[PDB]
Amino acid sequence: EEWAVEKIIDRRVRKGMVEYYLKWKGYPETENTWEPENNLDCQDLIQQYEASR
Amino acid sequence: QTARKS
């Protein structure tokens, strides 16, 4: 399903899709995962990441 | 502020 995102750590393009490397709220860093942008409902975090980089 | 996994 869906899980709370703490922060976006990094961004890449893979296979033509933008992916974001996510720290999940309440999970260790070992659980960080790359997710395609369409998996996120994180408009505030994405715009803050994309403006501060 | 949520996301789907994989």
From Swiss-Prot, chain A:
Salivary gland (at protein level). The chain holds residues 22 to 74 of 206 of the full protein. Residues 29-39 have a biased composition (Low complexity). Homodimer. Probably associates with Su(var)3-9. Interacts with Mcm10. Interacts (via chromoshadow domain) with piwi (via N-terminal region). Interacts with Rrp6. Associates with and may be part of the HipHop-HOAP telomere capping complex but is not required for its stability or telomere localization. Interacts (via the chromo domain 2 (chromoshadow domain) and the hinge region between chromo domains 1 and 2) with cav/HOAP (via C-terminus); the interaction is direct. Each molecule of cav/HOAP interacts with 2 molecules of Su(var)205/HP1. Interacts with HipHop (via N-terminus). It comes from Drosophila melanogaster (Fruit fly). It comes from the Eukaryota. It is found in: Nucleus; Nucleus, Nucleoplasm; Chromosome; Chromosome, Telomere. This is Heterochromatin protein 1. Residues 3-53 form the Chromo domain. The record marks W3, W24, Y27 as: Histone H3K9me2 binding. Structural component of heterochromatin, involved in gene repression and the modification of position-effect-variegation. Recognizes and binds histone H3 tails methylated at 'Lys-9', leading to epigenetic repression. Stabilizes chromatin-associated RNAs probably by binding to them and thereby preventing their degradation. Associates with, and may be a part of, the HipHop-HOAP complex that recruits the MTV complex to form the terminin telomere-capping complex, which binds to chromosome ends in a sequence-independent manner and prevents telomere fusion.
